Amino acid sequence: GKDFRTDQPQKNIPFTLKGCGALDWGMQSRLSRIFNPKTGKTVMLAFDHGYFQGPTTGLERIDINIAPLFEHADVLMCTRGILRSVVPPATNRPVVLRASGANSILAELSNEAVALSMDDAVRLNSCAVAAQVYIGSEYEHQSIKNIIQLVDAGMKVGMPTMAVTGVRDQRYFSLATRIAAEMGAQIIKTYYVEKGFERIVAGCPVPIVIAGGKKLPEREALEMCWQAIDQGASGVDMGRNIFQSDHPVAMMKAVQAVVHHNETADRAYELYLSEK
Amino acid sequence: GKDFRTDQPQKNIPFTLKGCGALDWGMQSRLSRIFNPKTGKTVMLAFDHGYFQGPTTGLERIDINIAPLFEHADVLMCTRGILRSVVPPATNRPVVLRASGANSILAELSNEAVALSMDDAVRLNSCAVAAQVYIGSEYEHQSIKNIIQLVDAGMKVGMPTMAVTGVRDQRYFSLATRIAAEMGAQIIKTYYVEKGFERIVAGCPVPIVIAGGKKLPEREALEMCWQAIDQGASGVDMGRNIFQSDHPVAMMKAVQAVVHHNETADRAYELYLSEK
Amino acid sequence: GKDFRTDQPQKNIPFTLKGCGALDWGMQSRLSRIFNPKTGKTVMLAFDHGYFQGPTTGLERIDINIAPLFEHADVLMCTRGILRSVVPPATNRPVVLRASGANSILAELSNEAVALSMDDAVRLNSCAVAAQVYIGSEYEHQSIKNIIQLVDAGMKVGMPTMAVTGVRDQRYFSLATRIAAEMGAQIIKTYYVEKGFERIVAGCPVPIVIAGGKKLPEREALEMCWQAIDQGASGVDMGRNIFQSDHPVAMMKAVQAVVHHNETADRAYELYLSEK
Amino acid sequence: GKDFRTDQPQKNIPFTLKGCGALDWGMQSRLSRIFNPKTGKTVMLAFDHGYFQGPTTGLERIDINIAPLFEHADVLMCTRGILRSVVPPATNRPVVLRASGANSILAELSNEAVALSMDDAVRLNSCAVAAQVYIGSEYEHQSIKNIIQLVDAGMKVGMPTMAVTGVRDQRYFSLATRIAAEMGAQIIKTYYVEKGFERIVAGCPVPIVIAGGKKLPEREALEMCWQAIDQGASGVDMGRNIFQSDHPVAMMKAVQAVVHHNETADRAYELYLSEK
Amino acid sequence: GKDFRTDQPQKNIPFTLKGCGALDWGMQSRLSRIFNPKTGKTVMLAFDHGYFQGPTTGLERIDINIAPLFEHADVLMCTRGILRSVVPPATNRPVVLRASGANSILAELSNEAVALSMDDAVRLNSCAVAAQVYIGSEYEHQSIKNIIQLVDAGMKVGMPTMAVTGVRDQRYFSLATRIAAEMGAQIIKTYYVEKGFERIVAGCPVPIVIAGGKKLPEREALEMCWQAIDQGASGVDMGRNIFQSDHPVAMMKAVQAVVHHNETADRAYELYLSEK
Amino acid sequence: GKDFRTDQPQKNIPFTLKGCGALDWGMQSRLSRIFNPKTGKTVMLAFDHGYFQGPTTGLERIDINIAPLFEHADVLMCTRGILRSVVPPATNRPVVLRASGANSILAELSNEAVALSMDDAVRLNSCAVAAQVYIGSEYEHQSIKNIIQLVDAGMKVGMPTMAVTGVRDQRYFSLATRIAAEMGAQIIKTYYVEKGFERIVAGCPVPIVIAGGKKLPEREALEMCWQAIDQGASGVDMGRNIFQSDHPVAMMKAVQAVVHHNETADRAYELYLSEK
Amino acid sequence: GKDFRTDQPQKNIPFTLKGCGALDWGMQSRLSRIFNPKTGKTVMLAFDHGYFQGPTTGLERIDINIAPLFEHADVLMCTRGILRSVVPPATNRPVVLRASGANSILAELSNEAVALSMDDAVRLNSCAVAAQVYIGSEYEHQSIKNIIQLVDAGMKVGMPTMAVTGVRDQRYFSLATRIAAEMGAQIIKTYYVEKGFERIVAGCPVPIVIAGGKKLPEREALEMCWQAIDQGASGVDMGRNIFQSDHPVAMMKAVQAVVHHNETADRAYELYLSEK
């Protein structure tokens, strides 16, 4: 009375996430937490700037200002320090730990070191670890070494590594993104570019996520989102453009719309206003 | 132009999951994946029986039969072998890896050993590892040693351990659950008991999940669920009672209702029929 | 304008705790948490019996029954499982982790293995780790090996080891306590003996703590306490005799008095009744 | 005849210490040794200055001058060298080991390295390890790296890390404290600021303890204490302001009062005089 | 009824690959994948330039441009990043992983560090790992240290190391190739030289492979190939000269012919045109 | 004005201790602590019997009975437990730690395991570690494995191993001593034999020390000592025959005389009486 | 003025030793010490029997009896105990360390365990390590495991492993030798067989050395040697047949002759008598 369904042969489900087709199950799993499998994209709420900047504006009180924001994000990005202290475990959202540091705004910006062991990143159940790479800066060599070291460790343990390009035109980000990706980073985070972003994406063999940069009027930020996605980015991280907006949650739903659901910039903006 | 909100002092968000208030962030995180923070409960779809049983009925083809079932479960439980081969990473559901094995239905049932390294469990992004404890059986000592070893390893790494009690009355399950919990297991999985289940829960300091046992008519299984939850269980795993039902998905929604939403057995059953 | 007080030469303060004069600072420190430096004694509240016994009477609900008891104890003794789940860290009392297990009341009692890694004992900030030795029982060899192994590990890390003698006359406890001590245990926990206890203490080169055994009427337990201390024991652990008493806290103050303050059994009992 | 109290369901005791709600039992335990659970605060007697300063005034003879002081402190802070040699283990007080060093007052102050292994810290039963971070100084990068490394090690083992900010206004200590905390330090030690201290506390997600700085007249030091506490500090360390006072013990009870008991500066001072 | 063929004595098959006669079986095996045992030569398709160059011309899209090229190569050479993301495992071709990096075209070229652990190289089933040595450049010391370290690791594990000489006459390449070989590299990759290439090969005790350098008209590249082989090279890597040619596949068959089959430059070229 | 004394060539001082001529400096040093370089012999005061025997007669109180005895011994032999608790470090005598145990007089005698890690032996500054071998007993295999393991460890670290033969004629001790020595033990401890002791010594390639065995009248013990030495033993250990004598110190001087100074039994005995 | 001899191409010298053509340089080097490269054979003087036998006849005093014998042997075989104590390092002969033991002639012969770490073998500069395999005996499983373990370790380090077959006809030694070889042993040592030895050799893919067995009259031992060599053995070990002969040295020259130089048995014997 057992059925092996011999007439129907087992078939492998493809993993479509860009450039992550050859990864072990655990690694693909972590990535799948970050990038929605249906849409292949992610909305990331990153608040890690304290790491070299101290209490930046809008990050003065993560526990109050940002805590309400978590639910509307696909993935969180912060330091391990902040995570343990003021991010509730029950927040139940995937995190990308920031794992570079040891610079200040008072000194050379590119002077970064690995800021936590994979050991602890694994201890914290991270979906990925992130570090900054600084092509063209004084400590560009150490920066890449940082990525390298994170990838060596991540590979033993199934932890993806995200390389963030710290700094301004396409040719440049192409170099920076590509080198990072090539070194082994599974996720690249970078900036949007008004001319030639497509080349950047096309040249990168792994998913790209874009950082928001300085605060803009929402309408403009959304347009940037819309453009980035339209041009093949896999996620957007609006930092300042979110936690700094007077209507954060509204903004996020805007961003969710552009990213996952395809809304056009205008509609997006409108529900932006809708949700105030 | 910065606001530290000095008038409002940072306050710690309590972690209410039973007996899990003193765990590092990562461990609390993994547990939060398993047990819903809002309701403090879980619906678990366990298909690990192949481990000593081979192609048991209804588990003949996980890839076909059970694959459709994943989305309606809070947490999956299977072997690492099965997980890699036929569970799609994109399934994006938390897994509890079954980590004991080396027994057959052809020999002594309690003769189990640890069946994978924490190393690999971590590599596979598990939310927990599970092993069987066999109080009263011939290899009861090894079984506990197994739990012990998994907890020693999990604590290095933030991985919770689930001890499952393999075997029939309350006093008995009390002993078995309690010893396991006392050894260190963060989650206990065990069987429902018509008389005295409350004592079992009350005496266990950590979350309890119940296994379904042999297939029953749905109405009866739901009643069992309803009872277990009403009596303080933190989740239910209906194995056979689900994958074997002619209308699996419908059953799961039934179970979701009882567990998370509080529906009474009858209503539950009714949407059971509703969903066919 | 600096004073080195050359006329007054630095002198070493002796460490008087019995048999612990040649230990490193950290180990001496942990022992000092357990045994009061002024009186050289400890009142221990041990509730670890669940470890092979399940929900023994009075330990049904540690979180409710025993939780109120902590403050009146010098040192707590429990399993790591119970400690993490239901002992509040803020309890701020030194713990001795029970580190043997894998036996049941359903099987041979002496069949114990080491139940946690020093690694985790250290992670849990223990003052000491404890295991049972079973001279004359079937698994007496393993039991000693367990002590040995715990001492090998504790020495790397500054962790004292407590050997408990599980089982009935003096000559016997002498053999057992002495072997344990000799193997390397810093603390011996054992049973009181109506004839010859003095020889037991005298023959042990390290501190002895006595377990209470089965519940007695308080008057009788106190007398036993009084006798044990009078005869050179360094501490008492009244398990059942405390958590099972109808007036626990009162009992503890009774015990405190006998142990630290020297009250005679009768006075002790009287404030026993006083404190109800 | 057993009572599981089923009518009464086990509930988790919150851990209220600021930013320490997501830590494993052991680490929470160590912290609870330092910061009183009832008041959430600590009085710290730090005499570690020898580390780069040699026999500073008042620290000429720890063994004579400071030894009497121990009992009136919540936590001690010294080097491992001093601890072993002249702090009696029986002192029975929690210690925070100073773990940075390799600088002299004869050379660049910020040139510090890690000055002991976590291995030894654990061997010494520390409640935490401390190192200095030097934002703005020449070796600011190494200083952070030192914190990072101590956190990486401490997390393996349950050991909290204290970052002390070495150097003068709020905006500055905000940057320094926040980066350290963000890197992962569980305790921040810093200086009081007459304007804007609240922002410093508000911006730090973990407990802050303030250093006394140069000796002041007691009345003034108390006011500083009072102000620090009133403004949200979790502890105070009056170094010079204590061991250098002509009436040390009296001062401490003054500080105890302000810190734990809430006395107003004036009353505090008065029992200061009272206790001479 | 068994035949041991005693009349015929077992004889050892020689391993003829240059300078690889004293290697363990596994190492010999990996080399045998790379260099054809019959002809003792290899045709290598290297696309690792992204590593310090970003999306160089013709490497813009490995996945599209180069993917078709794989089947006609003996061995592939790329970074671990590119390999995982866009090289299909089923490509079933031996790879030599590029294992140096951390330089940019924006900074000193010779500033390279080891860019992956042997650990991961082994995890990726590599046939060899490669790094650049830079005699005469600013970071020539680190470069050799790099080779050293890879050989140290590769020897533990059976992994050959390729040293590539980055930079122009014979005497020079002799120095560079020889030092690398001498340090321990099993494969040397270097440039062709119009005068004195013979001395270069003759002085190297291990196989040499030549890099193509800047794109040339095919006829000329083939002549270079032909010459290199004729003068004792063991393989050629035409990078640009292949992926940049308008007729890549045709080129490779050209190169295959010269290398393995001995065709003269002219015939080679002709089938070059033939295969368009 | 420097003199290299070229006319006088550096010459190597031989190391004459039997069978120890090919040992590294550290190991030769430790052995030199035990066996006097001038006479090549040792007087050993062993009190380790508590290890399986409990408080044997005369070892009831090491701290009182045996403490006076240390100064008159070349080397001490006890457990690590006893050593830490009641042997003063300032005793300044070399120790041979007893490193086997886990047996009781209540069970099979030969059932021993390694009783402490070389790690701790080294931590205790031992001159050697000792374990028992039991040829012909039930656990003879494990006993030899014990010796093997200690040697494996000791060789990493410069620690000599002493194998004691536990049990009755020459042919027998020859087998036992020789196997142990052959396995790798640097020192053999064994019993004296009235016929054929010479063959035992002659067949052992490394130093032999003899155990006293049951208490005898001093005159007879001395004669045994005298005979053992006369027949080539390298040391004697009179356990019972010393600590049990009514005039211990006198006895030791007797033994010193026979062993190091060559006194004849009678003279020896006489100063025995002399020294009462 | 440099000559690279381009006209003459580097060629690989074959390594002809049987079944050792695919080993790393170091391993081939150690084997080359044992087996003469010219003749591909070895004369081994083995005196390791003390290991389970005690002072066997003729091994009573290695230092005297056997010491003279070393120079006339190609390779020595003894225990590590004996080697350190009584084999002079200056003996300058290759040794094969006996690495199994823990049996006695008083108990089951096949009960052997690994008797030293590869770590020490390497420390002693061994050419190989040897252990016994016991097909058909009670502990045959452990015996093979022993070989396995040694090979695992030896391969890390370049150390060949010799398996000796302990026990009587061809079919039998075929099984035994072949299994050992197959497991991974590089050298097999076994007994000569009057019928079918050829099959044994032919069936073994690696060098075979024969043990002499019980003492025979020289003429007969020589004939055995001659026959073994004639039938394809790669070396002989005459233990007893040498150290027990009245004219040892003469015997060895006899054996040398048969083995390396091809002398016929008779001539061999004659120079046997010649050399007395």
Numbering used by the authors:
A (entry chain Q), B (entry chain N), C (entry chain M), D (entry chain R), E (entry chain P), F (entry chain L), ...: 10 to 176, 182 to 290
Paper text:
While sequence analysis suggests that LsrF will function as a class I aldolase and genetic data suggests LsrF is involved in P-AI-2 processing, the details of the role LsrF plays in processing P-AI-2 are not known. To begin addressing this question, we have determined the crystal structure of LsrF, alone and in complex with the P-AI-2 analogues ribose-5-phosphate and ribulose-5-phosphate. LsrF crystallizes as a decamer with each monomer having an (αβ)8-barrel fold, a ubiquitous fold commonly seen in proteins catalyzing aldolase reactions. The LsrF oligmer has a disk-like structure, with two rings of five monomers stacked on top of each other giving rise to a decamer with D5 symmetry.
Instead, the first 25 residues of the chain extend away from the barrel and pack against other subunits in a form of domain swapping previously unseen in aldolases. Monomers stacked on top of each other have extensive interactions that are significantly enhanced by a ‘swapping’ of N-terminal residues. In this swap, residues 10–24 extend away from the (αβ)8-barrel formed by their chain and pack into the interface between two adjacent monomers in the other pentamer, burying 460 Å2, or 21% of the accessible surface area of this swapped coil. When all of the interfaces are considered, approximately 40% of the total surface area is buried in oligomer formation, suggesting that the decamer is likely the predominant form of LsrF in vivo. A single water was built in the binding site of unliganded LsrF; this water is displaced upon ligand binding. Structural alignments of LsrF with a variety of type I aldolases, including FBP aldolase from rabbit and T. tenax, ADH synthase from M. jannaschii, and transaldolase B, DERA, and 2-keto-3-deoxy-6-phosphogluconate (KDPG) from E. coli show structural conservation of the catalytic lysine with LsrF K203. The aspartic acid is then thought to donate the proton back during the reforming of the imine. Rather, there is an aspartate (251) located only 2.9 Å from the K203, though on the other side of the lysine from the catalytic glutamate in rabbit FBP aldolase.
